[PDB]
Amino acid sequence: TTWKLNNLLLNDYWVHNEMKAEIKMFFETNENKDTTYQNLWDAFKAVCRGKFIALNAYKRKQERSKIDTLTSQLKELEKQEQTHSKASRRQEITKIRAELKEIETQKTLQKINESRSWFFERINKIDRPLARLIKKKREKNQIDTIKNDKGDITTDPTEIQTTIREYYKHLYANKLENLEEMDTFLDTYTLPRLNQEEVESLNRPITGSEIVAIINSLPTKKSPGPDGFTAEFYQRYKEELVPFLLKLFQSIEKEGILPNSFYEASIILIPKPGRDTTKKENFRPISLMNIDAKILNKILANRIQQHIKKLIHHDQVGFIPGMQGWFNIRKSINVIQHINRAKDKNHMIISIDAEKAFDKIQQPFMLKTLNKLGIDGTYFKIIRAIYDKPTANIILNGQKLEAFPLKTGTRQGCPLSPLLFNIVLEVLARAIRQEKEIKGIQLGKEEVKLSLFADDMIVYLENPIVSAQNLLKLISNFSKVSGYKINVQKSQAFLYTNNRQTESQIMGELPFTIASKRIKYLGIQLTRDVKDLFKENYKPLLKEIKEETNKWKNIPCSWVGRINIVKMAILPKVIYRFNAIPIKLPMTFFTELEKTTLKFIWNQKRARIAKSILSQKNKAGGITLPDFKLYYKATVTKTAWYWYQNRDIDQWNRTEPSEIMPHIYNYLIFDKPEKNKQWGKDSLFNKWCWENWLAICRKLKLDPFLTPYTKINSRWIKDLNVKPKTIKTLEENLGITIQDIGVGKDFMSKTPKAMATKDKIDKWDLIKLKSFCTAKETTIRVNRQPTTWEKIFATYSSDKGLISRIYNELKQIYKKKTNNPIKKWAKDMNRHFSKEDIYAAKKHMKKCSSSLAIREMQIKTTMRYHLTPVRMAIIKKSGNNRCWRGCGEIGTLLHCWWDCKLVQPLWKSVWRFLRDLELEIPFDPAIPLLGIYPNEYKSCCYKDTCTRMFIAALFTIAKTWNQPKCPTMIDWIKKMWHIYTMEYYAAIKNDEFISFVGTWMKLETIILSKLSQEQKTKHRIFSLIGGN
DNA sequence: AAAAAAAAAAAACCCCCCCC
DNA sequence: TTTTTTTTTTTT
DNA sequence: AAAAAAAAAA
RNA sequence: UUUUUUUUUUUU
Ligand SMILES: Nc1ncnc2c1ncn2[C@H]1C[C@H](O)[C@@H](COP(=O)(O)OP(=O)(O)OP(=O)(O)O)O1
Ligand SMILES: [Mn+2]
Ligand SMILES: [Zn+2]
Secondary structure: OOOOOHHHHOOOHHHHHHHHHHHHHHHHHHOOOOOOHHHHHHHHHHHHHHHHHHHHHHHHHHHOOOHHHHHHHHHHHHHHHHHOOOOOHHHHHHHHHHHHHHHHHHHHHHHHHHHHHHHOOOOOOOOOOHHHHOOOOOOOOOOOOOOOOOEEOOOOOHHHHHHHHHHHHHHHHOOOOHHHHHHHHHHHOOOOOOOOHHHOOOHHOOOHHHHHHHHHHHHOOOOOOOOOOHHHHHOOOOHHHHHHHHHHHHEEHHHOOOOOOHHHEEEEEEEOOOOOOOOOOHHEEEEEOOHHHHHHHHHHHHHOOOOOHOOOOOOEEOOOOOOOOOOHHHHHHHHHHHHOOOOOOOOEEEEEEEOOOOOOHHHHHHHHHHHHHOOHHHHHOOOOOOOOOEEEEEEEEEEEOOOOOOOOOOOOOOHHHHHHHHHHHHHHHHHHHOOOOOEEEEEOOEEOOOOEEOEEEEEEOOOOHHHHHHHHHHHHHHHHOOOEOOOOOOOOEEEEOHHHHHHHHHHHHOOOOEEEEEEEEEEEEEEHHHHHHHHHHHHHHHHHHEEEEEEEEOOOOHHHHHHHHHHHHHHHHHHHHHOOOOOOOOOOHHHHHHHHHHHHHHOOOOOOOOOHHHHHOOOOOOOOOOOOOHHHHHHHHHHHHHHHOOOOHHHHHOOOOOOOOOOOOOHOOOOOOOOOOOOOOOOOOHHHHHHHEEEEHHHOOOOOOOOOOOEEOOOHHHOOOOOHHHHHHHHHHHOEEEHOOOHHHOOOOOOOOHHHHOOOOOHHHHHHHHHHHHHHHHHHHHHHOOOHHHHHHHHOOOOOOOHHHHHHHHHHOOOOOOHHHHHHHHHOOOOOEEEEEEEHHHHHHOOOOOOHHHHHHHHHOOOOOOHHHHHHHHHOOOOOOOOOOOHHHHHHHHHHEEEEEOOHHHHHHHHHHHHHOOOOOOOOOOHHHHHHOOOOOOOOOOOOHHHHHHHHHHHHHHHHOOOOOOHHHHHHHHHHHHHHHHHHHHHHOOOOOOHHHHHHHHHHHHHOOOOOOHHHHHHHHOOOOOOO
C-alpha cells in the first residue's frame, strides 16, 4: 500500500503552517557540506512524508476527540450497568447514545451537504460532473483475465501478475550495444546542429523563476508519483520549496547525479480503446513520476522546445507547439487528390504507425542523436543522468509489483518524452527526405515525401515498386540502430497502380495491408478517391452524433445541461472534422445536425425557447447555443489567416492542385482582385475558403482588396513592375503593409527611416510607388480605420484561437432579429420597459447566482419557458383556457406566476419577509419575475438577498405549477434554506464567506425567527453561520 | 442565375421541479 | 402563443 | 493577460 | 488511471 497525499489536507490552515515550519526547520538543520544534495533531498522527501502521516493522524485524532470520549464513557457505563443495573446509569447511557447519534448524523449530513454543494455549483456547466454523466462507468484497474504464454485463458491473480510483470520486464530489457552501427547511421545523413548561442541557451544556469514557471504550469488534480506527493504540494508550499528545488537542480547540474527518487516510477496499464482487453500487449504502460522529477523534465522540455522549431522539420507536427494536426490531414488529402487526377497512377501512400513508439526507442541512440544535434554539456549530461538507471514498478490491481529496470524505451507520462521521441524519429524523417532513391510525389514546384504526427508517419511515393522497397530498407536500417518497429497490424497503404502485375508484386513484397477504401489517420478517414470524403467522414459523423443522442435521450439533465453537453462533447468532434476537411458541405448535413442537436436538447419535444433566441449572444440568453453553420464558416475561413501570413511551414497550402497561377493563395487577401481569372476549378479547401471569405466581406460591406493591411509583396505593388529588391527593402526597413510606408501625404514621411529607405530604392520604382501611393483612391482605401474582421486576419501573428475569434465575429455579423420575450412580459402587465429595463433584466438573467440551476430557473421564468392554460388550450385547439389549480380566472403567464389567488399568498408572504428586512419594495410582478427594478433603486446591498428570495419563490411556484393546492410559505423557506446551505458550503470551499454572509445573514435570522421549533427540527433548518 | 433574408402559415401536445 | 418550416420576393 | 472545464490527436 | 500539442466553452 503506497501512500498518497490527500489534497484536502493541504487546505487546512494549521496543518499548512505546521508543515511549512517543519520544512524550513528540517531543511535548515540538515543542510551541510558533509553530504550531497541528492540524498538530502531524498531525506527531505521521506521526512515530509513521515510528518504528513503524523499530521494526518493527529488531525484524525483531534477531529474525533469528543466522540471518542463519549464512546469511552458509554462503554464504561454499559459495563457498569451490566455488572450492576441502575436507573441513573440507564439514563446516562441513553443520553450519551442520543448525543453520539446526533453528532454522527450531523457529520454525515455535513458530508453529503458538502458533496451536494460541490455538485450544485457545477450542476449543468462544462465540468467534471457533466462529463462523468456523459461518460460510461469508470473502468477499474482490476485486470483479471489475460492471455498467458501457452495460449489459454487464465484468471489466477498470481499467474496474471507474473505474466504481466515478466512481459513488461522483457519489453524494457532489450538494450542494443551496437554503438558503431548507430554512429554510422547518424554520420550517413545530415542533421541540424545547434550553434553556440542555442547550445549556451540549453546549458544556461537554472533560475528560480524557471522553477516557479514550471510549478505554476503543473496540471492539478493529477495522480501523484510513487513518492506520494501531488503537484499541489509543490504549488502550495512553493515559497519555501523554490530555493531548495533550485539548489538541488544546481547540484544536479554541477555533479550530474540525480536523487534516487527521480528514477523510480509507477506503471499503470490503461486498456487501449478498440483493442482486445485479454491481450497483454494491448495495454499502454503510462508512468507516474514524482512531481519533482516531472518539474526537472518539464524544465528540460521547455529548454529543448525553445529550439524544437530548428531541430525538427515542419513535416512533423505532433507534440510540436504552434502546428495543428490537420496540417498533415489537408496535405495528405491534397496529395491523394493529385494522385486521383494523375493521368498515370504509380503512387503509394503508406500510413505507418510505430509499434510502441517510445517503448522500444533506444536510449543509446537517443544520446547519440542529441550529441549529433549539437546538444552537449550540462543539458545533455542531465539527459544522460535521467536515463542512467530508470526504474518502474507496475501498480497492478492496486498492488505494487517488484520493480524492473528500464534499460530500453522512453518513460511514458514524462514531460520530456514527446520531445526526445520526436528528436529521435526526426533522424528517420530526414533520412527519408534525403534519400533520393525513394521518390516523393511532385505536386507543382514542390516535392512531397512525408508527414509526421507523433509516430503516425504518412509517406507519399512515386514509382512505388522501387520507392517502397528502398523505404523499407531505410526503415530496417533505422530499426537496427534505434529499435523503431513498424506496427504491421495498424499500418496501411493506398496503392494506385494501372498495372495488375506490378500491383500484385507490390502486395507480394510489401507487408503493409493495402487499404482499398479508407485509412483512419488522426481520427480522419482518408479516402482512396478524394470525392468520397463527405460520405466517409461526415455521414459517419452524423451517424455517430445520432447514436450518441439516442444513448443520451434518457439522461437526467435539463435543457441547459443538454446544451452544455452538446458544447462539451459533440462540438469538439464537429470542429475537428471541419478543421481537418473543410470541404463544401451540403445544407442537408447542417439541417440534420441541427435537428439532431435540438431534438437532444429538448428531449424530443417542442422547443420552449426559440433556437433563434438562444443562437444570439449570452446577452439575450445567458447560456447561448452552438451554431454549427457559423462554426463551419469559422473553420473554413480560418485558412484565410494562413493565406495572409504566407509562412514557409504551411506546405499544406501549396499542395492544392492548380494549373493557373500556382502561387495565388498568398495574393488573394487584402490584395488586388483577379481579372475574372478562372483559377481553382477542382481545389477542395482553398476555393471554398476564398468564396466564404469574400461572402463575409460582402456581408460587412467592406472592400477586401485594398486594405490598410495590404502587403508590400501584394499584387498591387507587383503589377507596377517594380523590382523585387524594392519590395525586400521596404519589408526590411519600413514594414510589411502599405500603411508602414504611408500613402497620400504620408508617403515615406512619418518616420525618419523613410529618408534612408528612399536612398536604397531605384528612382524609377520610387516614382512609380509615389504615383500609386498618392492616388486619391489608394489614399482613401488604405488610410481608413480597419474593422475587427480585418484585424483578426492581419494583426494576429499567432494562429491560437482563430476559430473562436472568427466565430464570435460571425455571430456579431450574422445577428438575426428575434422576438424579445421581455417585451411580451411588458405587454402582459400592460406596462412599458425601457432599454435600461431590458438591460437590467438581461443582466439579472446573466448573473442572478453563480450556480447554473438558479440561473436556469431565472431564465425559464423570464424567457416564458413555462406552459400555460391559455397556450395549451390554443395548442390543443380546445377552449380549456381556464387557469390551472382551479380559480375560475383566465390562465395567462402573469396569472399563473403572479395574479392567481392560489399563488398570491406566497408572494404576500415573500413581501412580508421583505418588509421585516426594512425593505420598501413595490408590489411589482416585474421585480421577482424578471428582476426589473425602478430606476431609483440604485442601491445594490439588497440585490442578492431579494434575488435569492424571489428565485426560491419561483422554484416553489413551479413545484406546484398545476397542482390545486396553493404554494405555501414553508416550502418556499425550505427552498431558501437549500439554496442557503449550498451557497454556504460553496463560499466555505471557494473562500467567499464574507459576501455570502452579507447577503444571507439577516434573511437567515428572519427565517429562524419566523419558524417554529417543530418546523425547524422536522425540516432540518438551522443556522450554519455565527457572528462573523 | 444563385444565395441569403424575411414573412406567412401550420403544428404543437393541459404541469413543474426533482433526478449524482 | 410560440416555434419551425416553407415560400415568395429582392439583391448581388 | 489569468483561472477552470471539456474535447481531438498522439 | 499520467505526458505533449491543439481546439473550444465559461467565468473576469
Ligand atoms: N493516452 C496517452 N497517454 C500518454 N501517452 C500517450 C497516450 N496515447 C499515446 N501516447 C504516446 C505514447 C506512445 O508511444 C505514442 C504513440 O501513440 P500510439 O501510436 O497511439 O501508440 P503506441 O506507439 O504506444 O503503440 P501501438 O502503435 O502498438 O498502439 O504516443
Ligand atoms: Mn504507435
Ligand atoms: Zn389562476
